[PDB]
Design a protein around this ligand. Sequence first.
Ligand SMILES: Nc1ncnc2c1ncn2[C@@H]1O[C@H](COP(=O)(O)OP(=O)(O)OP(=O)(O)O)[C@@H](O)[C@H]1O
Ligand SMILES: Nc1ncnc2c1ncn2[C@@H]1O[C@H](COP(=O)(O)OP(=O)(O)OP(=O)(O)O)[C@@H](O)[C@H]1O
Ligand SMILES: [Zn+2]
Ligand SMILES: [Zn+2]
Ligand SMILES: [Zn+2]
Lengths: 580, 34, 248, 272, 607
Amino acid sequence: VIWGTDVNVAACKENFQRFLQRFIDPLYMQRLGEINVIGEPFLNVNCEHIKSFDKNLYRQLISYPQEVIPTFDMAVNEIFFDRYPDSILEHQIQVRPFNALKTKNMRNLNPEDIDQLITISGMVIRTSQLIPEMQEAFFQCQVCAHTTRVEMDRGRIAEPSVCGRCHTTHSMALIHNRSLFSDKQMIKLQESPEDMPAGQTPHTVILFAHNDLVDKVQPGDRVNVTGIYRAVPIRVNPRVSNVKSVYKTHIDVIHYRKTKLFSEKRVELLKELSRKPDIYERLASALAPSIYEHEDIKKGILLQLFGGTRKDFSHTGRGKFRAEINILLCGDPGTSKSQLLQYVYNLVPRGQYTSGKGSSAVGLTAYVMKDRQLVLQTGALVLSDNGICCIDEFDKMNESTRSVLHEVMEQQTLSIAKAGIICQLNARTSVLAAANPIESQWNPKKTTIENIQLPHTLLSRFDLIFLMLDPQDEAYDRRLAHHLVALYYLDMAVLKDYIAYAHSTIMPRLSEEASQALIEAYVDMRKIGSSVSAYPRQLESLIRLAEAHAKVRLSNKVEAIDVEEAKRLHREALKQSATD
Amino acid sequence: SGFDDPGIFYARKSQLQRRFKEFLRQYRVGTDRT
Amino acid sequence: TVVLDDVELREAQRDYLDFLDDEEDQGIYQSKVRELISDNQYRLIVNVNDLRRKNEKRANRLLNNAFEELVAFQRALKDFVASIDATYAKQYEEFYVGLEGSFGSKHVSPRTLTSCFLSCVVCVEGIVTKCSLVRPKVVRSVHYCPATKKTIERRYSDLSVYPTKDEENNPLETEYGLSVYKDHQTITIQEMPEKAPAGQLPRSVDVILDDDLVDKAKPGDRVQVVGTYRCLPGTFRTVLIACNVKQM
Amino acid sequence: CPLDPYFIMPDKCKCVDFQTLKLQELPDAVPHGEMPRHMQLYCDRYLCDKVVPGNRVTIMGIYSIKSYIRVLGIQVDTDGSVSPQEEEEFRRLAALPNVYEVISKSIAPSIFGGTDMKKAIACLLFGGSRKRLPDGLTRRGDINLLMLGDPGTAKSQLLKFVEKCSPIGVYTSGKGSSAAGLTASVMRDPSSRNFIMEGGAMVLADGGVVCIDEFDKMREDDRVAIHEAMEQQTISIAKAGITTTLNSRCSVLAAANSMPTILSRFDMIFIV
Amino acid sequence: LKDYALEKEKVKKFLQEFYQDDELGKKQFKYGNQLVRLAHREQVALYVDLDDVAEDDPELVDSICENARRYAKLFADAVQELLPQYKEREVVNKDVLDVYIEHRLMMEQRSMVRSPQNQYPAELMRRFELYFQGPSSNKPRVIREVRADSVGKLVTVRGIVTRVSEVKPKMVVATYTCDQCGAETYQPIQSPTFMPLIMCPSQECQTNRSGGRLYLQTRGSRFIKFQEMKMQEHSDQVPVGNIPRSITVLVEGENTRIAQPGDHVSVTGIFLPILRVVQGLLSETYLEAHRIVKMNLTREELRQIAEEDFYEKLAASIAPEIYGHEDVKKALLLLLVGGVDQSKIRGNINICLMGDPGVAKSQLLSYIDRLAPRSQYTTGGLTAAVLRLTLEGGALVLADQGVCCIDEFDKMAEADRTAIHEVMEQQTISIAKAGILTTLNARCSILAAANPAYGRYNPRRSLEQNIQLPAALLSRFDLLWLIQDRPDRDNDLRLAQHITYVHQHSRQPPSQFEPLDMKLMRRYIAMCREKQPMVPESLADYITAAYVEMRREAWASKDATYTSARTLLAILRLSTALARLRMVDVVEKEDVNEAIRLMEMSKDSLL
Ligand SMILES: Nc1ncnc2c1ncn2[C@@H]1O[C@H](COP(=O)(O)OP(=O)(O)OP(=O)(O)O)[C@@H](O)[C@H]1O
Ligand SMILES: Nc1ncnc2c1ncn2[C@@H]1O[C@H](COP(=O)(O)OP(=O)(O)OP(=O)(O)O)[C@@H](O)[C@H]1O
Ligand SMILES: [Zn+2]
Ligand SMILES: [Zn+2]
Ligand SMILES: [Zn+2]
């Protein structure tokens, strides 16, 4: 065996080659045919299959990944020289294993795991251009043009310092383009923040795609990266050979996995309680228990959590539909709006919290910045591409920001003309905006536009405008206080799993009952407004709400009850916003 | 803290030394009878 | 660059004192030093084989390593004499160790005394041919500086050279009484003429004697000497420092 | 690290035995009328001291230059050292009844004025027998002749002839001026300031013949040594008590004109 | 002066033969069992109590303390020697390092005398970490007391973590392979930097002279967890005339990740020099970490507590030289004791002060900071930062349930205004220098102080008309007190009389109750923190009755008086805070009423 290891080249190759041919879910030889037909010589492998097939080889694999992988390549190439012995390929088959060790708490990583293959889930934050890394430097004498090359002198390139033909002093200068190069794109990735237990100090690591798997993942992608953990010294000065006793560590990526749920008991349990007739009311009341005397608002945000079913309108040429729900909660200061956003943001997965001010630390926009790599820093909206962005003080925002919010609400994407090029960053978020009335309190008889002073277009894009006020009712003050002092002296986990499963599995589809009910609702609203009348945007909101309400019941189809309650809440939002 | 130096620890001439070593110890003289 | 403690020498010095501490045992060496105190000499004689019996390792160390081991032993001897009698110890600046008994391979002859025994104890046997006059050799010269009112020393030991002026160039007048001198004589041994092949050349070995060992030899004496064979400063002349001489 | 000066510490400076020797080309191997060359021999470990000058030996070593040899192995001619045709001629020669007369006549025809001295020289060249007595002592097999009289007579040519004729023929003079001279000599080489023993002509010609011009003019120490040398074929050099003995079993042809006790020990003598 | 081999046997005896009666009086070789765990790879960090050595050899303990580094190596090698004895199982080859160690041992066994170089470093025969724990006798030492005299010794200290670097791998033994002879070369490392080896000193390449060029191998080499931190003197340690002093501390191995900035920790370890030449060499010092622990009267005193005017007397003792403002002085006292945080509740009592310059405001904060057991003073750094690569906590973090007095509050940067908003909201500080929202537990009470712009306050101009702060942020404060420079010739004359006495006496005029020593005050506070009074539900009825009454007054008021559930919760904090002052574990109606009185006065201050 190679020194300091338990690794036999032939036996490991034979065992791996045996695993390729002999497997129980044989799929490896089938995708070998796909690679032979397609010609893409990279054969990615789930390492857990090797664990199931042979844990010792899997253990042996992880211990010495750099050494075992060439054996794996030799196994597959000879298999390709066995299966499809004749073919044409620009390079022979490679392998990109993945999904081996879910020690994904990058905050919990140790020097014990140096040069051991690992996979971790995280969100790529910053990227770069593929670094042209020199690997063989052609050289030419200034005196006699002596042609020579130096090949892979251990990262650095050894200067000749003396010619070979005329043998003069140092005259052989490198020729850049004649030199050989490879691609090494550097990538900076943040540890998956939801996965972290505390999150008090989110972790970031550098990654490198060397000559392969380059540029395939753009910033903001929450993916599982699999590669070899690696550490290197750093010279105290470039000129001197002294180095620090501490090594900065990075990853040489091998595979990117773009990214069942729970066990049978949870799906059984959530399906059991879904059958409760008042699950919609219980879940609404159960949502945010610290709140008191708010049910319409709780139901609306609850429908926003479930959201409408994803709809692919590519065939229609109509563009992407805003399947997500955006609700603006407008109410007096001290009315629990901030607590509602914090509770939802804390509860919700892959969500974000920001404030309308530009002083918000996260920032609701993405823009370039130089280290001096002019690299793009993302935004909370782009970060919450599928999550929920809880925006506080939405009334106090800049017009440039308001234009951005109109765009993403109109498109669920953000267009940024970085440098000169333009990029459309998808943001399919659910926007939980919170605004407060201008002046000390909300002046009655003044419209939301008057008392918040925002464009009619942008506020109209919000499917729901929930108006809440603190009434001047001492009984309400008395009951609220008793509720608080009662609190002075269902768990969120089950509700979170319910919503996640409903997102994952249940995708409500329309019923003609829902179709006719919605059409009846809109024309009734049109007739009421015939004498701020009805608009087809209101129909779209009613469409989305019924999808969410159907998703709440896990019916997997939109029913008339979804339409009826959606119209009820839509009228409640109208009643809350009614002014005439 | 730099105040002490740890000691570094750890045609072919050693091959030739082995050749002499096997020669001296393993060289056989005489015959099966003797 | 000033030594503080030597654990090995500490143990070796201790072990010798333990060996010389012959009270619970048969009392032979305690009686010897008591006789040495009464007889006023300052050179104990020791059978090496008894040292092997009490400590084979130390005896091996003594034979293989001479100069260091004896110095520890002399230290143990001087303390041991000081234990039995402080004032008698204080009479003499130092004390000496005499080896005896069987020396397995170190018992050689001037023909067979090769350079391999350098810095090893050797028990040579032969005949004394050349003898030099007794001479007193300075070892520790003591000087006084009336300008500075200061007294200094300078050992020589194994080591223009004589200091006569202060570093300030003040005169230094020596202190003869304070200084230390010791009689010193050189002789030469050869193989016994009867057992000496004519083909081989003569192999004559020098010997250095000091203190009471000076006059305990004459030419034409069949003598066994035990000592430490050492080189000299410079192809280097080599001489044997006698630790004890006996006339067989 | 004081600069170039450094202090050697003899306590740890391990050493080994050391010895230098001088080796000369054999009298057989030297070309006719040419001086044998000399080579320094360096023997340090147990190989050193195994030999004394006057031993016929063969060495194996390393040719080296500072010009000398580093010795690695020694073989000493403890005893002994020829085409059949040469033997048959020699057998034929002995078969001749007048081989005595042929040998006597054929030796020195160039010189004139020889009568039965040729015969004596012949018998000297053959020599007697180095007998071993039953007691174990040995008697000198050599035979030594002395020529006294006219230096005008060309006996020097006869000495030059016979030494060339002898298998081991060394021709020197009693005033030969060699530092060793005829016999051994111990002298402190001032270059190294150490005693270097050197063999003289007699020991060099061991088993051979020695031609000595001006034998009357032997050196005083040479005069002392020649007594035992003729009487015992052995030069004894004394170093206080131990005295090395060098073997010189060489016949002696002496030339002179006019110490007298040595003349009693000569086997034979003739006047010019 | 002492043979380490002899000391090596004593510790080996002590390790193999020390035991203590564990739970249920189980006679157990505590270290021996850990040795069994260590041989099984079940333990890595082996913390050693020195008091166990003190149990049978206090002389050895002092010798250990006199040179801690030496005895640490002795203890480590003793464990290295005794590991095969306690080995009973051959556990699985945990990580490459064990199997690489085993392969190294096999080749060594495949080799008879051997040169010292051709043998593995003892520090490569490792994966057991060894540390000590300071004796109870050696009291914790103030940082300022630790000087060059105590270098080369083990000591215990206490302080506050100002900053910690991220965990990084520090090399222990560089490993290389010869280019030609293929022999392994080792290089233990001591200094924070070093030069990599080039030519292999192995015997074969040494003899062959084949130009064997060493090339490092990370797999061969051995690393260790390693982070850097700078503890700071505790507030009590520093005299009033002095300032805190930092001590770099190097945490390594298992000890890492055990602390955060602002943690009031206690560290035991060796104080040693690091050389990152007049009459000797000058070299920076540090404290090599071994153990880290994150820490938390007479009868007449009780009679004084029983006095009904006790808290009133204590209130008078808060800046007695500051004539008047006694109701405010009471409010400051409530802040110092804080709330209860029953379950949770935000027991912090953030108080904001506004008023014209020259009203003892600045002086009041200074007295509070002096009186406060743990406190920070700032003007407006305040928040954390990522220095360039270390988390450096701001004064808000360094409060850590103390109090962050903030003068010049109105002139704070608006970014900091947002930051303190989070602090009062969640008691946490989120900071993102590199877009990384690192969150720090900044639990503390905030005592703010500001003045109206454009000179003195104008009652004709509304609140926030004279001050440039978000009105919402003002509502977040538990109390907000206004001070106005009303020229009141008599009261102003009374203050002038007070000042002249102080000039003529360097003391305030003799009050009804003399002020008490600040230590006595802090002792009472510490006793008050012991209590966590509860709220009986009967009190809730009256509490709610009072709340709706004042809320009605707010509706009656033309200007909204910020009454909300926030106001109710603050009243709950004050009442239970008063209950702590009473040393009574039940909030009284009296406590509720007084809190409402202060609330009303704070509202009345808005007049
Ligand atoms: N209807 C209600 N039910 C329960 N709690 C309430 C209600 N109204 C107010 N509260 C309480 O009042 C306090 C309001 O705090 P919070 O900061 O969330 O208010 P907000 O209205 O979002 O404020 P702002 O608009 O000024 O940011 C919280 O304690 C909240 O629990
Ligand atoms: N009510 C008071 N009682 C006693 N001394 C007072 C009072 N008000 C002000 N002083 C004295 O005023 C002097 C100077 O003003 P002071 O330091 O109190 O200003 P300040 O209120 O902190 O002002 P600012 O916040 O504008 O800097 C202080 O020495 C303090 O003793
Ligand atoms: Zn050229
Ligand atoms: Zn020097
Ligand atoms: Zn080598």
